[PDB]
Symmetry: D3
Subunit: 153 residues, 6 copies
């Protein structure tokens, strides 16, 4: 259904390198609907929990330190297939494997400085959204372009 | 041969969502030559004929209604391999399958709101060009850049 | 009134230099509505008439020859203040006087190769639209975005 | 360089997919984002934000529209950012705004003019205080600060 | 005459902030012709001589130190009125006074970090070009678009 | 991260006003420009640069065209930049290149394919040595190096 949601974050390198607007533009251009947006400074414990599935991996310590080293921009986007589609926009995890046209393909080199995050499944997206956003920070609204973007609307 | 031609249309969602300029720019940037251009309101019967091969498909009635719901921009582009190359610029029919960099990859979500059309073969292109354009509507001209774009020119 | 209309043309240098998409994009981005569009080859006599007020000027013969030397893209745009606003988007007649941000400011050098034309008043626009377009060539439609662009809509 | 301003993408700007474009322009200029939120103003927030226009005949419509859907509120930091932000936005009436500015490139009607920016250092301080809690601002150092400023 | 030339430099901040391509694009888009291009590290003495007219000004010391602190990209552009036109593209000296659409209007804040330089007169342009470029580094060529950009060509 | 590659805008790319666009793509990616020059290759330079194609039937035409007008030669530095540069360029035949790449967005014909990039670390070292004198390369530290690389 077009009401699917995903969590996207500009990581601290993406904020530092002035990629916030560019990343948001790509999601707006695609037809996805912005329903949550904030600038925040993750704590180490927040980073640990966000990446909890990766706790045994050797990059985890550095990942958690880096993710909490400076501000991120957290977002919630709504749209048909937006979890998968958000990942398509981001490009492959390792920028070396990402193609031009994607965020990581255009703007990143190193897997540890890969500028952005996106939820990897509908289930993890729900968890991430719930973790980073309060219900008061999510806005219910209708895009005036909804019938131009979706057939069934 | 560099004189190959194809029919590209901005569908009514593409016009509504202000993608006419962006789509033309992509074709110009590639090196293709614009030889026909018009804004028109297809009739339902024109839409039925344009998509006649698809008459048995479950989506046909909706396709034909939508395509005739408002203005399209019809184009004829000329260049080496332009039929296939135009379709590559458009991206996969279903935008969920389209890659970033392409028109559908960058701007569309839903297969029924996929912003554009391109002819699928040399012979269908000839048919579509003849259906939408009278002989006197095409403009033959030489790009000042033809020898920078083509080795053989 | 938001139903005001103007005639804009991409002149033959603008077509040759692949500025058609870029010019249309600027008008779409502004909120103006495309209601007429075609590619055509003006005749010398059409060019003489289009610029008839300038018949005594030293540049007229060159202007009329050039304007009829290859294809133009003719457009009719609709929107509040579109005659004046279209000219603002174009920039100063002589590109040496045009500011960055405008079409001439960004893309042109020479007053005789200034890439585009726009009607200079409401009444000249009506004349130019009638000269270049038959009634049946215009397309009336409602932008899905009209109430986001205009308070009164 | 620690001057701050409040910039909002108005509901028309959100609806018309200009959030990223607007943020990009401010990032490109060298300004630093220190606050960002998406919210739908209440009627009362809309009345207060525009409190100096309460006696104008366009007020109730401005209030209703500003509270009709989400805005994006921003706090930007930088040398001369109050004046600079308004230069990026362009003239209040898009008819008067020049290409290159946000209103010049994207808006037609004064009542649907896409964005807001504080008009002075003091009004910025008041708008920031109105729209953001203390804990919602983020203090950080751009790694590019010495490239943007001589005195850093 | 269209053979006028000017010296443009991306200053060390402009190089550091990844504005080389953007600056070159703006000059290419305008119709100006690139006839010299190099990356170099100015010496302090080179910076002193380049800015010799400003030797008594209180910012001079800091200007010369900064200009020689890292690489610049030096360019020579050719075109009708290119000295004045290059300055128009750059925008006002102090970015606070520069308008959006210009290089300094779009990308700079501080007069001491104003990302680029352009010659201020035909005479100073000749001096600057001669100072920064050897004759072997200037390329004589003809743009295939010269007749599309200039009437008299 | 100290890997280097040679990228050239070919004479068609210069003529078609793609120099800035190409440089922008490499800067945006995070790669560092350490050499840059505009020059018109001699016939002999064109023959040598393409020496591994000397037995091909398209050679003399490639040589004549490559020496017909100015190119822009570049040296870029960064992790995996040889492979990365070629990914940015796209497939050799623009018919096979995808949108988003330089050839995918801007070229049609294999003989007018806008740009060149070294095919390997060793060929890059040889191309760099051929096109640039030692004194023409500039060593410098991007202020953004720690934002682009974890190990910096
Ligand atoms: N070998 C690796 C793998 C991942 N990572 C980082 O760990 C993050 C999370 O890994 P992940 O497997 O969930 O990948 P994504 O979901 O981000 O694509 C990545 O986005 C990288 O920034 C790393 O630094 N080195
Ligand atoms: N399952 C489908 C397939 C196609 N369509 C629409 O029907 C149009 C014509 O289908 P097609 O098979 O000719 O595909 P293209 O030639 O447009 O790639 C597509 O462009 C879609 O807009 C659809 O709505 N649902
Ligand atoms: N001194 C001049 C004035 C105008 N012209 C050309 O003549 C066209 C018509 O002139 P105009 O006075 O109607 O100006 P616009 O309405 O195009 O601003 C201009 O757009 C120029 O292309 C010229 O070549 N030399
Ligand atoms: N005559 C007017 C004046 C202002 N307005 C709106 O009211 C807003 C606030 O007015 P203002 O005087 O504070 O102008 P700015 O601070 O936005 O430049 C404007 O941005 C317009 O959207 C209007 O609709 N009609
Ligand atoms: N008050 C000033 C004036 C100039 N400058 C710097 O000195 C440079 C040369 O000054 P200039 O008067 O030749 O200005 P332009 O020709 O660069 O516009 C400027 O581009 C500034 O970078 C400064 O740092 N502070
Ligand atoms: N069949 C071919 C193959 C290559 N070429 C040209 O020769 C150049 C060098 O060939 P190459 O095999 O080194 O390919 P790349 O390294 O450029 O990918 C290509 O970039 C083409 O411009 C051609 O014109 N026809
Ligand atoms: Mg993950
Ligand atoms: Mg089909
Ligand atoms: Mg006129
Ligand atoms: Mg105000
Ligand atoms: Mg000066
Ligand atoms: Mg090769």
């Amino acid at each position: 259904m077009p009401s699917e949601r995903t969590f996207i974050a500009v990581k601290p390198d993406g904020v530092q390198r002035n990629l916030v607007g560019e990343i948001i533009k790509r999601f707006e251009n695609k037809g996805y609907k912005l329903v949550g947006l904030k600038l925040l400074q993750p704590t180490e414990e927040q980073a640990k929990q966000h990446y909890i599935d990766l706790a045994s991996k050797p990059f985890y310590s550095g990942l958690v330190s880096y993710f909490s080293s400076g501000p991120i921009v957290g977002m919630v986007w709504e749209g048909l297939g937006v979890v998968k589609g958000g990942r398509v926009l981001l490009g492959a995890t390792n920028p070396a494997d990402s193609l031009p046209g994607t965020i990581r393909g255009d703007f990143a080199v190193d897997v540890g400085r890969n500028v952005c995050h996106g939820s990897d499944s509908v289930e993890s997206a729900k968890r991430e959204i719930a973790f980073w956003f309060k219900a008061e920070e999510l806005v219910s609204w209708t895009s005036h372009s909804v019938k131009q973007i979706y057939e069934r609307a």
